[PDB]
Amino acid sequence: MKEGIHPKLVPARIICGCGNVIETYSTKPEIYVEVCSKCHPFYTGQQRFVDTEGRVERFQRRYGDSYRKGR
Amino acid sequence: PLDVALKRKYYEEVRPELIRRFGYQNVWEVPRLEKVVINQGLGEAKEDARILEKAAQELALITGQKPAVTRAKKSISNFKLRKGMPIGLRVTLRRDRMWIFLEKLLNVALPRIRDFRGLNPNSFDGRGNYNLGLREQLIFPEITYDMVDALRGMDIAVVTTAETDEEARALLELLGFPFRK
Amino acid sequence: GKGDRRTRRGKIWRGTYGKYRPRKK
Amino acid sequence: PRSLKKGVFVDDHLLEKVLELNAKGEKRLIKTWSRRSTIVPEMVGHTIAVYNGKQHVPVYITENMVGHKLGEFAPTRTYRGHGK
Amino acid sequence: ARIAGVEIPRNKRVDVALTYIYGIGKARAKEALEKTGINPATRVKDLTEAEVVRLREYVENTWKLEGELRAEVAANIKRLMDIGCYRGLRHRRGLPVRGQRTRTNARTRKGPRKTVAGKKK
RNA sequence: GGCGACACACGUGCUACAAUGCCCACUACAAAGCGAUGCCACCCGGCAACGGGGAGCUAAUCGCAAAAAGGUGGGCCCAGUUCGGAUUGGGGUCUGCAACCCGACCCCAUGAAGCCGGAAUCGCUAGUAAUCGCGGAUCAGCCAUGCCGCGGUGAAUACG
RNA sequence: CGCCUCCUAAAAGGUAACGGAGGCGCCCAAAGGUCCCCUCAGGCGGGACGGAAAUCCGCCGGAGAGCGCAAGGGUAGAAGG
Ligand SMILES: [Mg+2]
Ligand SMILES: [Mg+2]
Ligand SMILES: [Mg+2]
Ligand SMILES: [Mg+2]
Ligand SMILES: [Mg+2]
Ligand SMILES: [Mg+2]
Ligand SMILES: [Mg+2]
Ligand SMILES: [Mg+2]
Ligand SMILES: [Mg+2]
């Protein structure tokens, strides 16, 4: 490249609950961000915290236990 | 030169699985990416030239490379312009720099998208180049949010040496890009 | 306020009781 | 709301006309004056001519309307705009 | 540290800060912090990272948040659409759904005031 | 089924636009009324509306019932911000063949417009104005913010 | 009423009519000299605010772009950027 207003791009580190991406090679080393996808959380791995659906289990099957009108 | 895990992930897992899939005889017709490009279409920067001073370095913080501005090609009076009027700026990233930008892209930049339920998979040009654009820029970890005052996204380009998009869809899945199946 | 169904001042203006104004002083 | 102390489907006049249309075949549209009634779950895929005040409107019971009653699917008031 | 998506509250008193999140009210923010046992009187700027990730492990898993909660509610309106219910056509017309006499003042859901001819002038 | 329809216009009211203010905990002090084909003391379950048991009361001896403003202490730092509560989703409790058009509430989220009101216009001369709650009538229940009453704190001003 | 361009103009040139149809009385210290580099308009897909084209990819595109201004000749193996 060329000497001037150009970042040196030093090897860095990023911390989260997901883990420490050791390499990551970016400017402003030892940065803090909220999450890291594709490690363990963030749906690619099929988490489904709430499994939101209310058309069958309380609207079609097991219906006599309570009333209706949606999910 | 600089040891990159994404190119290590390429050369160890992604590279040999594709030879098994399509039966590439030689080591070269296998899909390979070189020269990814980022375009920031600042159409709202037609009036101001000081706002680009506060946007070129902020795109440079996530790439590690200074971007170049692009001038207006012609003139259309429905938009405020002239033959000059620096509107957008575009930077291209290559070997050892394009790899590290993608590593921060798939894992740290991409999850910040609210309600992200996969990428649009039929966004291929037909040759093998998967384009996509983003509307927010603070998704990158280099932005601390306490230095941003203007909200502006970007259009990162894409590249491959694949003749068809069917060859690139696999490499775009084995490297880790989340799609809508 | 007096019309806010989730406060002491709103329950007394309405006349109903609940979590934000129990039947116990 | 009944608040679960008592069960749903208060009217006993139209269930006598629909509880055998499941065992016996011959799917037939039936007219009614029971707007106050609740919808029936075991009779999806049929039609009912619910009275709105002057004309019995036919309504296809689909898989989504197993929750609401019969009067919401029978408007007693029409508007069609007021720009005329 | 961002807790609920990206747009989160920060700077001065966690107890009423969390309320700014759609899907998080005054009661469930009091129902979710004592179970984490965090002092409601602390300012959000000075916290240890252990509880800000422990709080980012307890509210976004127990229930839906701003983005995904809007997706169900907007589709709940669409689910109550294309069936012909009174609740469905009342939204498509953009008028209030629970009674609320539309002859007089109902400008909250209808919108701004419009003016028509208005006879006898 | 409609009298409650709504692209509109007007009158009467209610709650607000906040810091001589809002929220939370504790602590006081009234008058007038009503209630054994009812008011419900007191426990138990539910975050709650309420439900199950169940004592007393033809009632200046029982119940509605808690009065609120006020007082003590803490939080908020004046930002459409725990001001403000509309609108909408879900879940529910009672009354009642029976609550979608047409109820009343309870809970969890919404938490919008409004930051002091153009031209005009109203009420009041001493415990009134302002502000704060309570009861009754009809009524199974109720859209009652209405109406009829009751008390608490308590101004200013009137040359003419 | 003078000048430029096309036609009439009959294949060198030239050629008239109150014949057909347009422009000019300027502009530029960069729009000039030299050296170096670069290739257009369009069409098709793809891509946040982006619409018939604001900036960007990837093919196709030897001239229809452009060459300050009318028109003609000419031009990318550039006089264009
Ligand atoms: Mg919120
Ligand atoms: Mg007039
Ligand atoms: Mg009437
Ligand atoms: Mg006595
Ligand atoms: Mg007098
Ligand atoms: Mg000639
Ligand atoms: Mg000749
Ligand atoms: Mg000749
Ligand atoms: Mg396009």
UniProtKB/Swiss-Prot annotation, chain B:
The record's Gene Ontology cellular component field reads:
ribonucleoprotein complex; ribosome
Q: Is this entry keyworded Signal?
A: no
Under Pfam families, the record lists:
Ribosomal_L5 (PF00281), Ribosomal_L5_C (PF00673)
Q: Return the InterPro entries for the record.
A: Ribosomal_uL5, Ribosomal_uL5_bac-type, Ribosomal_uL5_C, Ribosomal_uL5_CS, Ribosomal_uL5_dom_sf, Ribosomal_uL5_N
Instruction: Give the matching PROSITE patterns.
Output: RIBOSOMAL_L5
What GO biological process terms are annotated to this protein in UniProt? Answer: translation
**Molecular function in Gene Ontology:** rRNA binding; structural constituent of ribosome; tRNA binding
Q: Which NCBIfam families does its entry note?
A: PRK00010.1 (NF000585)
Q: What is this protein called?
A: Large ribosomal subunit protein uL5
Q: What does UniProt list as this organism's lineage?
A: Bacteria, Thermotogati, Deinococcota, Deinococci, Thermales
UniProtKB/Swiss-Prot annotation, chain C:
* InterPro entries per the UniProt record, alphabetical: Ribosomal_bTHX, Ribosomal_bTHX/bTHXc/bTHXm
Q: Is Ion transport one of the keywords?
A: no
Q: Give me the Gene Ontology terms describing cellular component.
A: ribonucleoprotein complex; ribosome
Lineage: superkingdom: Bacteria
> Which residue ranges are recorded for the region named Disordered?
1-25
Member of which family?
Belongs to the bacterial ribosomal protein bTHX family.
Its annotated function is as follows:
Binds at the top of the head of the 30S subunit. It stabilizes a number of different RNA elements and thus is important for subunit structure.
This protein's name: Small ribosomal subunit protein bTHX
Taxonomic placement: Bacteria, Thermotogati, Deinococcota, Deinococci, Thermales
Swiss-Prot record, chain D:
A single BP term in Gene Ontology:
translation
Keyword Nucleus included in the entry's annotation: no
Where is it found, in Gene Ontology cellular component terms?
cytoplasm; small ribosomal subunit
**Any one GO MF annotation of this record:** structural constituent of ribosome
Among InterPro entries, the record links this protein to: Ribosomal_uS19, Ribosomal_uS19_bac-type, Ribosomal_uS19_CS, Ribosomal_uS19_SF
Known SUPFAM superfamilies for this protein? Ribosomal protein S19
Q: Which domain of life is it from?
A: Bacteria
- List UniProt keywords, sorted A-Z: Ribonucleoprotein, Ribosomal protein, RNA-binding, rRNA-binding
Q: Does the keyword RNA-binding apply?
A: yes
* Described purpose of this protein according to its UniProt entry: Located at the top of the head of the 30S subunit, extending towards the 50S subunit, which it may contact in the 70S complex. Contacts several RNA helices of the 16S rRNA.
UniProt cross-references to PANTHER family, sorted A to Z = RIBOSOMAL PROTEIN S19P FAMILY MEMBER, SMALL RIBOSOMAL SUBUNIT PROTEIN US19M
Q: Which NCBIfam families match?
A: rpsS_bact
Q: How does it assemble?
A: Part of the 30S ribosomal subunit. Forms a loose dimer with protein S13.
**Family membership:** Belongs to the universal ribosomal protein uS19 family.
Name of the protein in its database record: Small ribosomal subunit protein uS19
Identify the species of origin: Thermus thermophilus (strain ATCC 27634 / DSM 579 / HB8)
Q: Which gene encodes it?
A: rpsS
From Swiss-Prot, chain E:
Query: What is a single molecular function from GO for this protein?
Result: tRNA binding
Q: Keyword check for Protein biosynthesis, yes or no.
A: no
Is Iron-sulfur among this UniProt entry's keywords?
no
GO annotation, biological process: translation
Q: Which parts of the chain span the membrane according to its record?
A: none
* Matches recorded under SUPFAM superfamilies: S13-like H2TH domain
Which residue ranges are recorded for the region named Disordered? 94-121
State the InterPro entries in the record.
Rbsml_uS13_C, Ribosomal_uS13, Ribosomal_uS13-like_H2TH, Ribosomal_uS13_bac-type, Ribosomal_uS13_CS
Keyword list, A-Z: Ribonucleoprotein, Ribosomal protein, RNA-binding, rRNA-binding, tRNA-binding
- Look up the record and report any one GO term of the cellular component aspect: small ribosomal subunit
UniProt xrefs under NCBIfam families: uS13_bact
Describe the protein's quaternary organization and the partners it interacts with: Part of the 30S ribosomal subunit. Forms a loose heterodimer with protein S19. Forms two bridges to the 50S subunit in the 70S ribosome, contacting protein L5 and the 23S rRNA; these bridges are straddled by the 5S rRNA.
- Briefly state the protein's biological role: Located at the top of the head of the 30S subunit, it contacts several helices of the 16S rRNA. In the 70S ribosome structure it contacts the 23S rRNA (bridge B1a) and protein L5 of the 50S subunit (bridge B1b), connecting the top of the two subunits; these bridges are in contact with the A site and P site tRNAs respectively and are implicated in movement during ribosome translocation. Separately contacts the tRNAs in the A and P sites.
Q: Which family does it belong to?
A: Belongs to the universal ribosomal protein uS13 family.
Give the protein name, as stated in the record: Small ribosomal subunit protein uS13
Can you name the source organism? Thermus thermophilus (strain ATCC 27634 / DSM 579 / HB8)
Query: Could you tell me the gene encoding this protein?
Result: rpsM
